[PDB]
Curated annotation (Swiss-Prot):
GO terms for molecular function: amine binding; dopamine binding; dopamine:sodium symporter activity; heterocyclic compound binding; metal ion binding; monoamine transmembrane transporter activity; neurotransmitter transmembrane transporter activity; norepinephrine:sodium symporter activity. Changing residue 96 to I: Reduces dopamine uptake. Residues 426-442, 510-546 are cytoplasmic. Chloride binds at residues 243, 247, 283. Monomer. Homooligomer; disulfide-linked. Interacts with PRKCABP and TGFB1I1. Interacts (via N-terminus) with SYNGR3 (via N-terminus). Interacts with SLC18A2. Interacts with TOR1A (ATP-bound); TOR1A regulates SLC6A3 subcellular location. Interacts with alpha-synuclein/SNCA. Interacts with SEPTIN4. This is Sodium-dependent dopamine transporter. Inhibited by cocaine, which occupies the same binding site as dopamine. Inhibited by zinc ions. Enhanced by the antibiotic valinomycin. Inhibited by benztropine. Inhibited by GBR 12909 dihydrochloride and amphetamine. Inhibited by mazindol, GBR 12783 dihydrochloride, nomifensine, diclofensine, amfonelic acid, Lu 19005, Win-35428, bupropion and ritalin. Dopamine binds at residues 23, 93, 97, 246, 348-349. It comes from Homo sapiens (Human). The gene is SLC6A3. It is a multi-pass membrane protein.
Amino acid sequence: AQDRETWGKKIDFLLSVIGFAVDLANVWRFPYLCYKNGGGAFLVPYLLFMVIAGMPLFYMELALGQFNREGAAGVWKICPILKGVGFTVILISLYVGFFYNVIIAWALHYLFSSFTTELPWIHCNNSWNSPNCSDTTPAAEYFERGVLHLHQSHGIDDLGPPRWQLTACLVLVIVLLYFSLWKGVKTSGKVVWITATMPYVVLTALLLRGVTLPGAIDGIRAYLSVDFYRLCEASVWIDAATQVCFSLGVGFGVLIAFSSYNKFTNNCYRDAIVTTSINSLTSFSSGFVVFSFLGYMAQKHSVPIGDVAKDGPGLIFIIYPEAIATLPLSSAWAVVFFIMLLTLGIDSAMGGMESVITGLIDEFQLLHRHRELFTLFIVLATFLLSLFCVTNGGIYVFTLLDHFAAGTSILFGVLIEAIGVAWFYGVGQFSDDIQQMTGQRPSLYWRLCWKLVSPCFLLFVVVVSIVTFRPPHYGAYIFPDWANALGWVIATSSMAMVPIYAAYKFCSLPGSFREKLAYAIAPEKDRELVDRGEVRQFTLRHWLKV
Ligand SMILES: CC(C)CCC[C@@H](C)[C@H]1CC[C@H]2[C@@H]3CC=C4C[C@@H](OC(=O)CCC(=O)O)CC[C@]4(C)[C@H]3CC[C@]12C
Ligand SMILES: CC(C)CCC[C@@H](C)[C@H]1CC[C@H]2[C@@H]3CC=C4C[C@@H](O)CC[C@]4(C)[C@H]3CC[C@]12C
Ligand SMILES: CC(C)CCC[C@@H](C)[C@H]1CC[C@H]2[C@@H]3CC=C4C[C@@H](O)CC[C@]4(C)[C@H]3CC[C@]12C
Ligand SMILES: CC(C)CCC[C@@H](C)[C@H]1CC[C@H]2[C@@H]3CC=C4C[C@@H](O)CC[C@]4(C)[C@H]3CC[C@]12C
Ligand SMILES: COC(=O)[C@H]1[C@@H](OC(=O)c2ccccc2)C[C@@H]2CC[C@H]1N2C
Ligand SMILES: [Cl-]
Ligand code: NA
């Protein structure tokens, strides 16, 4: 049995986790959400849900991965019946790889288009521009008709052939991903030294550029404006809970995979605290750049900052490029901005594909000795299934996947994972494992958060996400009913692995229905006890313990 590889340095693991957590959305979505829900007031619920349910779940995932020394699927030897959860998260990661890499392809396309003295999104005396342009705006028109070519597609049912420019950019992104992941963590941990730190350098450059622009200080003030009376709204609290759930990186199996390569005696508690703090602070600080630029644009157009900020995939390819085109040395700033976008997306894509590859390789030993070939297969499958999003109507497929690929699926996966780790396995045994690893047993606060607060919070978020579901849309396009049905099928194909694997495991285990249950819910480490008839999970005391 080949010894499992470990991170060459700890800075490798920390930067991998930070690069995965810090992505395009986290840098450009969170501050906009904060502004839209009371600005600084939105930090009250967010932090709260970070203290009681976010940090505990991050810590749980890291500790579980580190102790069990396996990926998302192999980690579930603590409760075999729930092992499908692993596959669920893996599937989600795989699904997110079929559309997320197209964002990096768009960023690469804009980067190659930025090496010119005349940026192609400053005016609309171009072949791709409709007569209606009047400074839809030139930047939005360029994005939609010169890069995506949406005007040539009538909807998700009229995708058309893949675009060769976008296909070439996707090929470049895919090659980068493969050569970043083919050798394991020994190369990924060194690639994150560049892809996880360049975004901060470019963000500092853009922050120093923006604050000096006219009208940027007004945008910053609007960002930091505190409206506590907005906290009486349930929408603010629901948005905070949803943002905490979807901004941490839990539910994809990536934290488990990353921590599975950590030394057993590593301190996952400090790692969780540090990484969560860095991710949250990065998301908060990116708001200063976002809203300096938004306030500058608002002053230029003489409109409220709320009107400038659009919502959608092209929020980073329409508004910020438009602001950059108006700066001195606009070409250099555009190149820097799109390099930052590439480095923000590439590390997250690497983290997701690492989750997929680690989980599947750990599950099946046939792929253990061949990681290069399996990485090539996974990457080529991602590329081939990513070709639907680079078609003429590729924004519609991208929107469908972005809405349904990791929505309620992530929340359900994290909920079932928390239940399995805190109830089926027990917070007592999890705490004993953490004490064995780090030497310090989790305090009562962590145990209570894992056992009671986190499951209730995740169940509430799942329920509100299902109840307040709104079908996806792009611009004036209304997705057809069959498109919504296909999206729900995609969302449920991840989550159905839990019941499917539960049924398969229950039927596979030999014995009566009391032997099957005992061997399915009891940890594999307790096998001897289960043989004598000493199942902890069969005692009410186990379930009521904290
Ligand atoms: C969005 C902007 C304002 C950035 C601020 C966010 C982070 C800096 C916050 C979000 C969640 C917070 C954490 C939530 C929970 C805890 C556990 C807490 O520990 C305890 O409650 C005691 C238990 C024990 O010591 O065993 C120590 C602070 C810490 C790490 C918090 C540190 C600060 C964090 C990372
Ligand atoms: C395992 C699977 C479900 C994960 C997601 C893969 C993606 C890339 C797949 C799954 C279902 C696919 C869609 C199935 C139906 C159609 C209608 C057809 O007229 C054009 C292609 C289009 C719009 C496909 C686009 C790509 C698609 C969204
Ligand atoms: C011009 C400046 C801002 C660019 C540099 C910013 C980058 C390199 C900085 C910003 C935040 C930093 C991280 C913050 C704290 C830690 C925890 C420590 O235990 C290991 C290093 C690590 C993980 C840092 C690595 C470098 C880092 C990612
Ligand atoms: C539409 C595409 C992208 C979906 C890919 C799904 C993944 C999870 C599938 C595709 C091929 C599969 C492998 C095919 C061959 C074997 C050998 C056999 O002993 C079962 C396990 C194993 C190793 C499978 C594991 C799961 C696997 C890697
Ligand atoms: C698309 O989903 C994401 O963007 C997630 C994540 O991305 C992926 O999980 C992923 C998976 C496969 C391919 C590409 C990206 C990065 C950060 C952390 C959680 C969230 N994001 C804030
Ligand atoms: Cl966040
Ligand atoms: Na990232």
